[PDB]
C-alpha cells in the first residue's frame, strides 16, 4: 500500500551530503518485488533477515536515498570507514536494516559530465550516526583563520562527481537506499502480508 515508488523509481535522487529521508508507517509492504526484483546490484541486510522481513512488525521505517560512486557502495555498512562513511552518511554500530544499491549509469550520466551530484570530503570531526550536514562553511586546515575566503589551507568542503558514460563500472553512479526500522513503545504499524 505504501509508496515504494517515491523512493526507488523516482525522477531525480539527492546527493549523498544531503540524503533524502522518507518516513513510512501504516503499510503492508510486499517485499517479493524487492528481494526478488532481479534488478539490484546489492541487497545487504543486517540485524534482519530478507526471508523474514515480512515477519517482524515495526513502528516506523525510514528510507534514506542518495547516489554514490560505485566503489563506495561497500562503505554503506555498519562499522565502516572511508571518505563517504564518516563525512557524508554513516550507519550506526547496532544497525538493523537493509542497504539496496543498483547501477544508474543510464539515468544519472551525461556526455558533458553530470555535475549536479556532490559529496563532502572535509569535516572537523566525524559524523555521529544518522546525521546530515549541509553547511558550506570553508574548512579550516592551517592555524591561520580565514573568514570565508578560499585559498591555501582553506578549502570548499564539497566536490562533484565526474559521471560520464565511458567511465568504468567502479566509477559509475549507483543509487543507494537504506531502510532502517524503528520499534518503540508506540504500537507496531508496518509489516507485510501475514
Amino acid at each position, epitope marked *: 500500500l505504501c509508496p515504494f515508488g517515491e523512493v526507488f523509481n523516482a525522477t531525480r535522487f539527492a546527493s549523498v551530503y544531503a540524503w533524502n529521508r522518507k518516513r513510512i508507517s501504516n503499510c503492508v509492504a510486499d517485499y517479493s518485488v524487492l528481494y526478488n526484483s532481479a534488478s539490484f546490484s546489492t541487497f545487504k541486510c543486517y540485524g534482519v533477515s530478507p526471508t523474514k522481513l515480512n515477519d517482524l512488525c515495526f513502528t516506523n521505517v525510514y528510507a534514506d536515498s542518495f547516489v554514490i560512486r560505485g566503489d563506495e557502495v561497500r562503505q554503506i555498512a555498519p562499522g565502516q570507514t572511508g571518505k563517504i562513511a564518516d563525512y557524508n552518511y554513516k550507519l550506526p554500530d547496532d544497525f538493523t536494516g537493509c542497504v539496496i544499491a543498483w547501477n544508474s549509469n543510464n539515468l544519472d550520466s551525461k556526455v558533458g559530465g553530470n555535475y549536479n551530484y556532490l559529496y563532502r570530503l572535509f569535516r572537523k570531526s566525524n559524523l555521529k550516526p544518522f546525521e546530515r550536514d549541509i553547511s558550506t562553511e570553508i574548512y579550516q586546515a592551517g592555524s591561520t583563520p580565514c573568514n570565508g575566503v578560499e585559498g*591555501f589551507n582553506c578549502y570548499f568542503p*564539497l566536490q*562533484s562527481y565526474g559521471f560520464q558514460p565511458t567511465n568504468g563500472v567502479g566509477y559509475q553512479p549507483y543509487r543507494v537506499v537504506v531502510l532502517s526500522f524503528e520499534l518503540l513503545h508506540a504500537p507496531a504499524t508496518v509489516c507485510g502480508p501475514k
Partner: antibody, heavy 123, light 112 residues
Framework: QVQLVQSGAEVKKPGASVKVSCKAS????????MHWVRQAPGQGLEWMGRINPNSGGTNYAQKFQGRVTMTRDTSISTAYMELSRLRSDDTAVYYC???????????????????WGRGTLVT | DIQMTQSPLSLPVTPGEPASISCRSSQSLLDSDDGNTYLDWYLQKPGQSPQLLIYTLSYRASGVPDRFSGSGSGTDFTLKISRVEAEDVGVYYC?????????FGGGTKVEI
C-alpha cells in the same frame, strides 16, 4: 582531444570591457580549479585570478580586484572572465590554465598548471 | 607578495653541455607543515603556450624528457639541463605558490 577551447581575438576600445571564455573538452570540468594568466607583449606572465567550479568562489590579485569578474557554467562546462575599464596596457594574450582540485590529503601540493589553453589576444 | 628574481636573463647554450638557471625568492618557499618547497618551472616556446616542466622543486611533469632536473634549497633554486637539446630553446619561468598573489619570475631566455 583533451583540450581547452578559448574565444577568438577581440578588439576593444579603451574604457570598454572584454569577455574571454574557456571551454573544457575531454575531462571533468569540476575536478580542476580554473586560473587566468595573461602575458603582455615583451613582459612576463601575470596571474589574474582563479575560480572554483564547485562553489563559484573566486580569488583575484589585488591589482585586478574590482574589475575582473569570473563566472562558471557547468551545464556547458565553460569559465568566463570579464575585465572592465580596459586600458592600453591590457593588450595581451590571456591563457586559461587548469589546476588539480585535490589530489592528496593536503590539496595544496598538486596545484600546478598541468594544462594551458591556446590563448586569446585582447587589444 | 613574493617577488622572484631569476639570474641568467640571457642564457646562450651549446648542445651537449649542462645549463643552470638560478631563481631567488624574497621569502623562503619551504613550508614547515609538510616539508615541501613550492616552486614550479615552466617553459614557453615561441608562439606556444607555457608547458609544465618541474613541480614541487624536485618532480618532473608528465611527458617531460629525462634531460631536465631541478633542485635547490631555502630561497636559491636551480633548474639544470644536463644535455641541452635543440628543442630546449625558449623562456623559463619560476613560479611560487605559497601566498596567493601567485607570482611568476621575470623569465630566462635560452637560445642557441
Amino acid at each position: 582531444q583533451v583540450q581547452l577551447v578559448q574565444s577568438g581575438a577581440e578588439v576593444k576600445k579603451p574604457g570598454a570591457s572584454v569577455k574571454v571564455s574557456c571551454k573544457a573538452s575531454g575531462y571533468t570540468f569540476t575536478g580542476y580549479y580554473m586560473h587566468w594568466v595573461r602575458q603582455a607583449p615583451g613582459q612576463g606572465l601575470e596571474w589574474m585570478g582563479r575560480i572554483n567550479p564547485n562553489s563559484g568562489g573566486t580569488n583575484y590579485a589585488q591589482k585586478f580586484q574590482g574589475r575582473v569578474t569570473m563566472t562558471r557554467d557547468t551545464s556547458i562546462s565553460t569559465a568566463y572572465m570579464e575585465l572592465s575599464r580596459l586600458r592600453s596596457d591590457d593588450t595581451a594574450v590571456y591563457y586559461c590554465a587548469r589546476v588539480p582540485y585535490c589530489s592528496s590529503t593536503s590539496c595544496h601540493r598538486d596545484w600546478y598548471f598541468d594544462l594551458w589553453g591556446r590563448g586569446t589576444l585582447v587589444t | 607578495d613574493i617577488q622572484m628574481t631569476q639570474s641568467p636573463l640571457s642564457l646562450p647554450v651549446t648542445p651537449g653541455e649542462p645549463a643552470s638557471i638560478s631563481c631567488r625568492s624574497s621569502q623562503s618557499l619551504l613550508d614547515s607543515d609538510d616539508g615541501n618547497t613550492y616552486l614550479d618551472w615552466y617553459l614557453q616556446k615561441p608562439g606556444q603556450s607555457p608547458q609544465l616542466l618541474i613541480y614541487t622543486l624536485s618532480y618532473r611533469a608528465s611527458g617531460v624528457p629525462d634531460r631536465f632536473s631541478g633542485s635547490g634549497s631555502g630561497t636559491d633554486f636551480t633548474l639544470k639541463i644536463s644535455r641541452v637539446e635543440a628543442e630546449d630553446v625558449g623562456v623559463y619561468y619560476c613560479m611560487q605558490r605559497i601566498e596567493f598573489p601567485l607570482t611568476f619570475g621575470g623569465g630566462t631566455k635560452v637560445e642557441i
